[PDB]
Amino acid sequence: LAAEQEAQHIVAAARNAKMARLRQAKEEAEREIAEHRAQVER
Amino acid sequence: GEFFSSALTSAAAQQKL
Amino acid sequence: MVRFIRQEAEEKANEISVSAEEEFNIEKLQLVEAEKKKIRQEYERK
């Protein structure tokens, strides 16, 4: 039914969304450390 | 098995279950 | 009704995903703060 079908998709996509968001967050986070290292190097 | 179709119809009409 | 409860469970899973994403962002900020600390460490050493 609608109840059985609807819940499966969002639950399945939740893990992928969490993984993608974590990877992206680390991606811009490492940029700040790289910029600080570049300023120190300069 | 016989009432599977009726159960599906009832679930569709009435309505992680 | 029942579909509402199922969507609520799916939204709870999505909220767990979002909380994990936020925790991972905070952890990444802490990790890059530690990386800046390490960079300052070997930079002062150099």
Q: What is the resolution of this structure in A?
A: 4.2
Distances in whole angstroms, Cα of residue A31 to Cα of each of A17, A21, C20: 21, 16, 21
C-alpha span between B15 and C1 (Å, rounded): 6
Interface check for C5 against chain A (CB to CB < 8 A): the answer is yes
Distance CA C46, CA C43 (A): 5
Helices (H) and strands (E) in chain B, counts: 1, 0
| 3-state DSSP percent of chain A in helix, strand and coil, to 5 | 95, 0, 5
Taking the Cβ of residue C32 and every Cβ of chain B, the question of whether any pair is shorter than 8 Å is answered with no
Are the beta carbons of B12 and A4 closer than 8 angstroms? no
Distance CA C35, CA C14 (A): 31
- Contact criterion met (CB below 8 Å) for C39 and A37: yes
Task: State how far residue A42 is from chain C, nearest Cα, in angstroms.
Answer: 11
Question: Tokens 């499966």 appear where?
Answer: A8
User: Which residues in chain A are contacts of B15 at CB distance < 8 A?
Assistant: 1-3
> How many angstroms separate the CA atoms of C32 and A26, rounded?
9
User: What is the rounded distance in angstroms from the CA atom of residue C44 to the CA atom of residue C35?
Assistant: 14
Q: Determine whether the interchain pair C20/A22 forms a contact, defined as Cβ–Cβ distance below 8 Å.
A: yes
CA–CA dist A1, B11 (Å, integer) = 6
Method: cryo-EM
